[PDB]
Design a protein around this ligand. Sequence first.
Ligand code: BCL
Ligand code: BCL
Ligand code: BCL
Ligand code: BCL
Ligand code: BCL
Ligand SMILES: CC(C)=CCC/C(C)=C\CC/C(C)=C/CC/C(C)=C\CC/C(C)=C/CC/C(C)=C/CC/C(C)=C/CC/C(C)=C/CC1=C(C)C(=O)c2ccccc2C1=O
Ligand SMILES: COC(C)(C)CCC/C(C)=C/C=C/C(C)=C/C=C/C(C)=C/C=C\C=C(C)\C=C\C=C(C)\C=C\C=C(/C)CCCC(C)(C)OC
Ligand SMILES: [Ca+2]
Ligand SMILES: [Ca+2]
Ligand SMILES: [Ca+2]
Ligand SMILES: [Ca+2]
Ligand SMILES: [Fe+3]
Ligand SMILES: [Mg+2]
Lengths: 318, 257, 42, 41, 43, 44, 272, 78, 73, 73, 72, 66
Amino acid sequence: PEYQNIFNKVQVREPAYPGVELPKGSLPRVGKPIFSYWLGKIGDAQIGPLYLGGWGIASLISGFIALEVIGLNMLASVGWDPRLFLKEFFWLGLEPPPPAYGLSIPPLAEGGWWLIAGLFLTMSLLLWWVRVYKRAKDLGMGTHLSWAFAVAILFFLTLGFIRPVLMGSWGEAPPFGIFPHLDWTAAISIRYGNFYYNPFHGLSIAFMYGSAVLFAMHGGTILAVSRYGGDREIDQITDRGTAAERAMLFWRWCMGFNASMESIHRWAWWFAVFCIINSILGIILTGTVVDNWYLWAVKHGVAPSYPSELTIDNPYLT
Amino acid sequence: EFGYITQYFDLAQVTLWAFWLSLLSVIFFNRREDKREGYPQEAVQIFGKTILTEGFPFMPAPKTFKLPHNGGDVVKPGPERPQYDFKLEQVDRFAGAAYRPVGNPMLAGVGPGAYAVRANKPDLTNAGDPRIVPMRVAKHFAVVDKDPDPRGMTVIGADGQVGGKVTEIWVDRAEPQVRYLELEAGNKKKVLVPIALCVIKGQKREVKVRSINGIHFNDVPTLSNYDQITLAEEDKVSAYYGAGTLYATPNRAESVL
Amino acid sequence: STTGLTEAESKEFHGIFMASMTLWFGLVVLAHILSWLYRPWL
Amino acid sequence: TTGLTEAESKEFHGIFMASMTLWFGLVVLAHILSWLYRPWL
Amino acid sequence: KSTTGLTEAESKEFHGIFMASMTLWFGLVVLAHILSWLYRPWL
Amino acid sequence: EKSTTGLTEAESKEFHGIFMASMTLWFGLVVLAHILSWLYRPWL
Amino acid sequence: ALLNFEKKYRVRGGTLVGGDLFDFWVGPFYVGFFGVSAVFFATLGTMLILFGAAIGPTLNIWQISIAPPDLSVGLGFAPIREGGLWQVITICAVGAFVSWALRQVEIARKLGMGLHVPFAFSFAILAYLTLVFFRPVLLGAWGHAFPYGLFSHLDWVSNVGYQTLHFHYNPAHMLAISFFFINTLALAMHGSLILSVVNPQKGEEVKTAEHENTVFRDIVGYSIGALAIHRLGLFLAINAAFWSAVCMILTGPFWTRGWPEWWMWWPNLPIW
Amino acid sequence: DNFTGTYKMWMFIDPRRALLFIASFQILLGILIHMIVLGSDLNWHSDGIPKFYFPNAAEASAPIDMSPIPSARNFKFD
Amino acid sequence: AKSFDGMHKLWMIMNPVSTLWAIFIFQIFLGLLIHMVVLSSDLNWHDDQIPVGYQLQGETLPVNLEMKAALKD
Amino acid sequence: AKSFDGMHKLWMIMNPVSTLWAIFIFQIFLGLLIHMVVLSSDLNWHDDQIPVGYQLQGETLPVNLEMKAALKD
Amino acid sequence: AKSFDGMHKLWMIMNPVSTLWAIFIFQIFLGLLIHMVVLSSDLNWHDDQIPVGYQLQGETLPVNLEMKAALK
Amino acid sequence: MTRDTNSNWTGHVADTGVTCYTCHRGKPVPEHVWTTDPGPDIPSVFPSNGQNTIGYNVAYTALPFD
Ligand code: BCL
Ligand code: BCL
Ligand code: BCL
Ligand code: BCL
Ligand code: BCL
Ligand SMILES: CC(C)=CCC/C(C)=C\CC/C(C)=C/CC/C(C)=C\CC/C(C)=C/CC/C(C)=C/CC/C(C)=C/CC/C(C)=C/CC1=C(C)C(=O)c2ccccc2C1=O
Ligand SMILES: COC(C)(C)CCC/C(C)=C/C=C/C(C)=C/C=C/C(C)=C/C=C\C=C(C)\C=C\C=C(C)\C=C\C=C(/C)CCCC(C)(C)OC
Ligand SMILES: [Ca+2]
Ligand SMILES: [Ca+2]
Ligand SMILES: [Ca+2]
Ligand SMILES: [Ca+2]
Ligand SMILES: [Fe+3]
Ligand SMILES: [Mg+2]
């Protein structure tokens, strides 16, 4: 057939690019850039350099302290054996305090290490937030990447710090494992009567499906007009060429309305952020306001009603 | 009692209403941003009169892009540059009918061969230099061995005939990668072909261009200066190759089954 | 030739390739005879 | 091609074979000791 | 052809010091194991 | 060729003087805090 | 209505079936043979869903449900009131989805562009056909597919999940979820970056491609590129769909225990 | 001596980066040691010295994992 | 018997170094796989406790038995 | 007896440095793997309590026994 | 016995700096790994309560015993 | 115990009942029984939480194993 533009057939090298000049008073960039042939088959081949200033070092100290703690407790749970660590790795975890301790600080091997790791991971993510903000603002760009990051951090803090405090127990938070955190997911659905009848859960699922749909559509459309220079979106925005025109006619003819080369990126932004906004809203109300989502859905006229034919006798009533 | 009810109104309900209203309102703003290009639209009336309409919701107020290196201001939604001179005949006498090109379809600029009217300036780097340039002007580039160097190969043209030979590679300095191949055609002109319309076979040492035919490489649009390319010229070249996807053979626009 | 080898180079490579493959298969057969003597599986 | 001539290849081959033989000798010795200590078949 | 830029004299020098260092390291390892066997024999 | 920070030898001497003074003062305060803690709640 | 620049692109040709008979527009839409087909099948399917709601107990939007046949029908034909309506609607649905994809192909041919979007749509279609055709055929009955109803296909999803005691430990399910999550993250970052470069700090010029590369190399140390992020996008979404189809074809036809017990192959390797 | 030329250290190690590392590390280590000591028998906030100030539970067991969420606040588990 | 004469020409269309590497890698993967498949069957030779069980031998040493006796008191 | 004469020419088509690195890395990985495979079988030599069990030796020291006695009261 | 004569030429094809870094990193990783493997076996030397158990020693101090008596 | 179950618990074993063979199946010690699980070996100052292992009796999940 015709070239599909999925891999780079011919590669070219020039000396590495150090980066746009920073404002005066900045630290130098660390690292000497290297090139990857395999990364260059699909994208850009340069790796590095990297910018390490004040906020991105405090972050990376916090995060690595947290990682050391989590790893060592997982390793103590098998008796220090690395062979068993590799053998049973998906079943290990660091577990939260027993719920009877409330919001106090428990002893170290009965939930205090969980508390330490949570605190250090929190600080890591807030320092990283400041780094992302300043990096985009020192180059003179809008700070749109910090708004979305803030939303994600808020969801991490909701399930984990805010909801456990509003409930009165640290033992309501997830543990640090793979299968352990999957077990937490299932159990919190079972305890509060079926998350499928949580309406914010349904809306966030709507927006996660929509993210996949929209990004398949956009990735397809821009690869399909890259023969007319469509992959260069900044120029198509500030001087509309034939690639943008064809891209917008396609969708107009197909489904009756369209966006522009700049507006589709606002649709992307919002579809990714409403998913997490509804995530926060659905978790923050569970347990603190609603105790059984299925009974809520029945009270508000939402759940179907299968035919019965039988009678089952509740043995606690007999 | 298993399903006893204490009170009908709760917080989850109100919050859900608030969300329905917060969506339903970003739709409004995004739909308004969608109409900074291509509007007001042209509605054709009962007996052919055309008016400008604007849709629902209405168009936003204009905003300004300030382009770098004194590249001017762009207001959007704003004026438009004038279309060129396409000729078309309608096929059926109603507003929703299709059109046919009047002359030679390859040299008409209608259908998949239409193009836009951009600036007559090159695209720039962050330093002020032209962005897309031949590899003899950019003296620091090199093709990575492990990859077939296309310089020298031939340009078979979709009906098996030869179009010409590759003589240069055009690179992109802002993001290092190949954008165009330059070739000498059958009548000894220098023409470009986009790299995203070329299948390169290293062992056969061929480049297959499925879009147009071999004799069609003589009429590809040419450049003013061969040390740079402008936005307008990019559009013209690419559009000429795109017209062949429907006009090269008389059987290409003719219902597969 | 699409690999750049002439016919003489191909003959040379083929000679040594066949010798090496024969030696490898000999060692495999020996390993299986020992295993059958120790722990017969059929 | 690797850019080695035939003399360089001969040299490399000599030392490669010597090294591999010594390594296999040490392996055999380790296994004799292990069989004496804890026989597995 | 793959090369490191070292001449034959530089390689001889590097090799001398490399072998000395490796021998000293292995000596220290042997000493550690003799102490461990005296304290807690494992075989 | 070699990695440098642009400081001359005089600037390095100056920085070193003040760095060592500050570190000594900090360690002094640490020792004082630990003497108080040992007097209040001995841990060994 | 036509856009400012639209008229020079509305030419004839590019079709698959039909020819010059259905080559027109109605308003902004393009019709074609497959446009007629799609609207025909969508209308018929919708009207049959509504009738199946009319013969049920309620017209509440959340509680409508049309269910498939019983497992005793096998791969046969069910009565209209006990499963046959579901079969007719599920024929209409396939007809409409495939029509949609082929109409897309006609449009792209007319505008001179590549067929990436119908190709990516094909994988959604494949996941649907896995749930209604392939899995039911391998298990031997149409009554293994899901009913048509909001809130009522969710009961199906729940009970099918619990038929394996813990469906989170399904391997292809884990892989698909990984792709879904990474796709939302990537879409957020891409949206943010383009908006940020054409909407800079107040009183500044529009930035360039060098700025786009620099920002991510400063934060993270690697930047993938403006054309490869579109590729990465097509890739993550398609893979999500693909591994969903695999995870459902595995459950029932090729595995009948609990899903945690599959993973037992790993700690039983004789190498630890 | 042997440490005569140590001050030349700052001619190839950046003093700005050194300072930024040391401050961060010291503050984080402060927080860490305080939380570690609070999660042990040396804890000084809820140890009941010189007095228990809260209305604590009269009979608080040793908490296990299979537990419900507590009804009132309590800080005396031992 | 002369039907395999031109066989040496195989290396004029197949690259020798690529083929060598492919063969070596495939052989190593297959070696690991067959050893693991046979170790997971009745033919396993590491855990069969032949010629003797060594963990069991360690549990019944007189010193270990006498120490386990003095603890069960 | 004369089949393996030209064998030294192997290094004119295969890169010596790449091959050396590959061999070294593979050997280290295999060393770790075989040690881990034998440690997870009946042949394990760290936990077999031969020549004596040391945890058991620590649990029955007279000092530890006398301290555990004075806690039962 | 003269089979290993040209061995010193190894450093004309293998980079000395890369080799040094690889050796150092591998040695540190192996040190950590072997210490952890031996500590998780019957040879464990931190928790074996030899030469004495310290938690048990703290539970039976006369001061702690007299305080636990007056509570109970 | 067998007489008690056969007479007083028919809400569960309704008119089919149990004999010895229902559990011993011709052996003096039944095949599937349980005791209070101590858990894996961990450091001596670490209390058991009772989960996050393989868990052979709870269908190989990371759920509480006893
Ligand atoms: C029952 C087991 C024994 C035990 C049996 C052994 C045995 C056996 C050995 C060790 C060895 C070591 N043990 Mg011990 N060891 C025990 C308990 C401990 C404990 C502890 C917290 O309980 C610690 C912290 C150590 C720590 C150490 C390291 C000093 C050394 C590992 C070096 C290394 O990895 O370098 C690898 C890293 C490099 C080579 C990088 C190169 C850096 C250069 C060369 C400088 C490094 C300095 C180096 C670490 C030490 C040299 C010491 C000086 C002469 C003072 N052991 C228990 C009691 N231990 C090993 C050793 O002694 O090596 C000689 C060794 O063979
Ligand atoms: C039972 C245990 C004791 C206890 C035992 C100790 C011990 C032991 C120490 C502390 C130290 C500290 N304790 Mg205390 N501490 C207790 C209870 C508390 C409580 C509380 C809520 O109960 C608080 C808030 C504190 C807080 C503090 C900090 C003032 C100080 C940590 C400094 C630091 O983090 O490095 C920050 C360091 C830097 C940023 C780098 C160097 C500082 C430079 C010069 C610039 C920073 C400005 C300024 C000097 C900051 C410190 C202010 C004072 C003047 C020291 N402790 C209980 C009662 N605490 C440490 C200390 O005293 O340090 C002298 C210390 O050694
Ligand atoms: C107790 C239940 C189990 C569970 C049981 C199941 C079952 C059962 C299934 C999944 C499936 C999925 N699960 Mg699960 N799942 C659970 C928990 C999770 C969790 C989580 C956070 O816990 C996540 C993130 C997921 C995520 C997922 C996805 C991997 C997958 C759904 C995407 C998909 O199928 O696309 C595929 C896309 C389609 C099927 C869409 C079809 C599109 C059609 C062609 C177009 C329709 C157009 C329409 C009619 C037009 C309307 C037009 C209007 C004009 C607008 N599950 C719990 C543990 N899960 C599903 C799956 O993998 O199926 C393949 C599935 O069947
Ligand atoms: C009951 C089953 C038997 C058993 C039955 C068999 C049988 C049957 C076979 C083996 C074979 C092998 N067995 Mg065994 N084997 C058993 C237990 C073991 C144990 C152990 C921990 O218990 C180990 C580590 C091994 C390891 C090995 C390897 C030596 C060999 C596979 C090499 C390979 O695949 O190269 C693949 C890699 C390549 C081809 C790359 C290129 C190789 C180059 C040319 C150099 C490699 C050198 C060669 C491996 C070593 C032989 C050289 C001589 C010393 C001269 N077996 C038990 C006791 N084993 C195979 C064999 O012997 O091959 C001849 C074989 O057929
Ligand atoms: C019951 C089982 C026996 C046992 C049976 C065997 C058997 C059988 C063998 C070993 C082999 C090894 N055993 Mg043992 N081994 C046991 C317990 C141990 C313990 C321990 C913590 O209990 C350790 C740490 C070791 C460690 C080792 C290594 C020294 C050696 C593997 C090296 C390698 O992987 O090279 C791979 C890496 C390369 C080739 C890269 C290149 C390295 C170059 C060439 C130089 C490296 C130096 C080399 C590592 C040391 C040689 C120094 C002296 C001259 C001997 N064994 C128990 C007691 N062990 C193997 C061996 O001795 O090989 C000769 C071997 O055949
Ligand atoms: C049904 C009925 C009663 C029919 C009677 C009418 C008659 C008689 C005939 C009409 C003729 C025909 C054939 C009509 C068929 C159409 C009908 C009826 C229905 C289909 C409508 C339909 C399926 C719409 C669904 C719309 C939805 C929900 C979309 C989901 C995704 C979404 C929200 C997208 C918003 C963002 C957009 C607009 C993305 C498109 C878009 C993308 C993705 C880019 O990448 C891009 C790149 C550069 C420039 C522009 C773009 C661009 O616009
Ligand atoms: C052996 O390994 C070594 C040591 C060598 C290092 C290797 C590291 C490795 C292999 C690590 C593996 C890690 C894994 C698999 C981690 C899995 C993590 C997952 C999937 C986690 C999922 C969820 C956890 C969540 C959401 C936790 C949220 C916790 C929060 C928000 C904590 C909040 C606590 C706070 C803010 C502190 C309050 C404390 C205080 C003091 C105020 O209380 C009063
Ligand atoms: Ca106190
Ligand atoms: Ca054996
Ligand atoms: Ca032993
Ligand atoms: Ca000890
Ligand atoms: Fe984009
Ligand atoms: Mg758990």
